[PDB]
Write an enzyme that holds these catalytic residues in place. Sequence first.
Site, short mmCIF file in Angstrom:
data_model
loop_
_atom_site.label_atom_id
_atom_site.label_comp_id
_atom_site.label_asym_id
_atom_site.label_seq_id
_atom_site.Cartn_x
_atom_site.Cartn_y
_atom_site.Cartn_z
N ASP A 285 0.61 -1.25 -0.01
CA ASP A 285 -0.02 0.01 0.19
C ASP A 285 0.86 1.49 -0.03
O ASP A 285 2.18 1.14 0.03
CB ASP A 285 -0.92 -0.03 1.28
N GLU A 491 -10.74 6.56 4.07
CA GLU A 491 -9.83 5.93 5.07
C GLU A 491 -9.88 6.66 6.37
O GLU A 491 -10.90 6.82 6.95
CB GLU A 491 -8.65 6.25 4.36
C1 LIG Z 1 -3.81 8.72 8.17
C2 LIG Z 1 -3.39 7.71 7.01
C3 LIG Z 1 -3.15 8.38 5.78
C4 LIG Z 1 -3.51 7.67 4.71
C5 LIG Z 1 -2.71 8.10 3.30
C6 LIG Z 1 -2.61 6.98 2.25
C7 LIG Z 1 -3.27 7.16 1.00
C8 LIG Z 1 -3.38 6.10 0.22
O1 LIG Z 1 -4.21 5.20 0.54
C9 LIG Z 1 -3.99 3.87 -0.05
O2 LIG Z 1 -3.58 4.17 -1.32
C10 LIG Z 1 -3.52 3.05 -2.40
C11 LIG Z 1 -3.24 3.84 -3.62
O3 LIG Z 1 -4.28 5.11 -4.12
C12 LIG Z 1 -5.23 2.51 -2.22
O4 LIG Z 1 -5.31 1.54 -3.36
C13 LIG Z 1 -5.52 1.83 -0.90
O5 LIG Z 1 -6.73 1.14 -0.86
C14 LIG Z 1 -5.23 2.86 0.13
O6 LIG Z 1 -5.24 2.18 1.15
#
Ligand SMILES: CCCCCCCCO[C@@H]1O[C@H](CO)[C@@H](O)[C@H](O)[C@H]1O
Length: 602
Positions: A285, A491
Amino acid sequence: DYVLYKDATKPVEDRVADLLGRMTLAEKIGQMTQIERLVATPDVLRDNFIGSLLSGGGSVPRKGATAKEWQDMVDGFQKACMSTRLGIPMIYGIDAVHGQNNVYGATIFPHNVGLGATRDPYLVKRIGEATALEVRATGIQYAFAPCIAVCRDPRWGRCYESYSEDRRIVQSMTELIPGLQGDVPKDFTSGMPFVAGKNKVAACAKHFVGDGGTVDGINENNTIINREGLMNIHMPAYKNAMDKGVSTVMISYSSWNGVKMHANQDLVTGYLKDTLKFKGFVISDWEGIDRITTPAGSDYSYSVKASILAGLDMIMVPNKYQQFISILTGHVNGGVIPMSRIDDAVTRILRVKFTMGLFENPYADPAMAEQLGKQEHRDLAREAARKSLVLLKNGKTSTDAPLLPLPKKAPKILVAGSHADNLGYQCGGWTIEWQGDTGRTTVGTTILEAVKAAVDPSTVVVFAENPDAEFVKSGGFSYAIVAVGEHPYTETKGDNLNLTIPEPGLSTVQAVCGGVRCATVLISGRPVVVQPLLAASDALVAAWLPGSEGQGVTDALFGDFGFTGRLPRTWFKSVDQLPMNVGDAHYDPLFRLGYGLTTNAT
Ligand SMILES: CCCCCCCCO[C@@H]1O[C@H](CO)[C@@H](O)[C@H](O)[C@H]1O
Ligand SMILES: *[C@@H]1O[C@H](CO)[C@@H](O[C@@H]2O[C@H](CO)[C@@H](O[C@@H]3O[C@H](CO)[C@@H](O)[C@H](O)[C@@H]3O)[C@H](O)[C@H]2NC(C)=O)[C@H](O[C@@H]2O[C@@H](C)[C@@H](O)[C@@H](O)[C@@H]2O)[C@H]1NC(C)=O
Ligand SMILES: *[C@@H]1O[C@H](CO)[C@@H](O[C@@H]2O[C@H](CO)[C@@H](O[C@@H]3O[C@H](CO)[C@@H](O)[C@H](O)[C@@H]3O)[C@H](O)[C@H]2NC(C)=O)[C@H](O)[C@H]1NC(C)=O
Ligand SMILES: *[C@@H]1O[C@H](CO)[C@@H](O)[C@H](O)[C@H]1NC(C)=O
């Protein structure tokens, strides 16, 4: 000399092996590197032999960019990758999680919770099919979907991305996969990656594993459960995904009993690869490896070591590629990560690329551009939205006339509420922007527009966003439709311990329903505190996050189709009951999983 890997008539495995044997360390590590378009440059892509790009949420060439603009962007990146010594095409990934949702004018389908309510796996397959076409309309070959999380606590900001708290429903909805990718051959081996060709996309089962099991639904947190619980709740749909040839798997930010998934060799290599026989590629991720440590990023050298040794194949960096490549290169040069581990990651990445036909069709098809927002796909989204609706109440007493379905012919009707004429709100998160947005962000039909499109020409439609009780009482209305609910979130922004809708919402419902009989349409990513809304309303519909096609809502309200959706989640009486799922010893729901009233088409 003849170059086997460039020969389209050769088996994938031979092509993979022939290419791998030619590659330098830099070319190998390059394949394992995914970068955001925002840091990509032709020189960067060429010089670092980059294997993949992505658009993060809202990472777009321009506000309002056409399908052709996307194609031109993706192809520009591809030309650079194709200019390397070995000419290995990059694969471009994006969160197309309810349609091709970053893209202006793309069909926006109901979010997964709503799709769970349909209990219709074939509908979901068709959605996967239409989604692949709209993704390919933009030149993109890879969707980060389906999220096969099993949300066990609706306080989780990603609960809407789960089809159900019931793993059996999540399992059934893995039909999105052969939709996106195409159906696997009859001879197919479970765990092998599959994409049918250039009108299909690689899919991604995410996020491995137990992302929906975190304590108090805290996003990215700790899933505290024994192996039996992990294996019977959070794991099963991954096996279905293996059987349907899912090309890639993304690792979860979450931990299992305090062990970061991004550092879990036992699960990623021992289980996913060595037990389930997954042969596609495993992707991190976004900054998932940075987040192994506390604070995040405080020992990136460890992050790289732990994640790569754990069995991850491709890293979604996505920005600091220089540091990633430099550190990984150092680890390999110093013997800390063996060549065999690198060779395994590259074998998997290449296998997926060769299998999907990327070497034969590295560039976009301009004839696909018109698949974006195509009316047939909207008709499908409209069908899905309608099927997703769960009717919770249809009359205040057992002796009342059912309010729904409503007549299309009435002298005057009221449409009201913060969610009645707000396209962004009815779409929710992952729409245009990462967090979603408010107002007219894309092409679609709001609930108000849908009402106006549905009613008899003699029916006067009045809109008032937040009318007072007097306006309603004085208005001469036959009935009202009032839409309220949650604001878009994604998220961690969605983590919520009280689950009460923002105001004005309840106050508007009370003011409206106090003056005229009312059908309340609840827009949410999840069950929310609903008793007060229920008490005020003649009828109440859980519409979830139905997407761009608001006519799905009115199709049911006006009786063109009967209500058929059933709750894919437990509806709690209060948040202090949580977590509370079907099968629990202390199960005291307001509405059990599977609840739903029905109507018949008029
Ligand atoms: C407080 C937490 C911060 C989260 C920031 C991370 C943003 C991205 O979040 C992630 O990005 C991937 C690509 O876009 C997605 O495919 C995932 O499902 C997602 O979990
Ligand atoms: C009036 O509306 C009700 C809605 O509940 C209809 O009854 C229901 O028909 C559904 C089929 O349209 C049944 O749903 C089931 O769906 C799952 C998954 O899609 C299937 O696996 C399963 O086999 C069913 O098809 C549901 O069982 C049924 N509900 C009950 C308890 O009555 C009703 O439809 C009509 O009556 C039923 C009993 C069936 O014979 C239908 O074929 C028939 O159309 C609606 N009545 C009218 C006048 O249309
Ligand atoms: C699950 O979520 C909880 C709650 O957020 C996490 O616990 C929290 O972890 C952070 C560390 O990033 C702590 O913040 C730190 O606190 C100290 C206080 O002395 C401070 O010096 C640091 O600057 C930093 O802010 C936080 O206190 C802590 N909170 C609680 C309530 O325990 C937990 O780590 C998460 N678990 C997993 C596995 O992700
Ligand atoms: C409940 O929590 C959410 C998210 O933190 C917040 O937006 C909402 O306003 C809260 N409700 C109240 C009134 O505390």
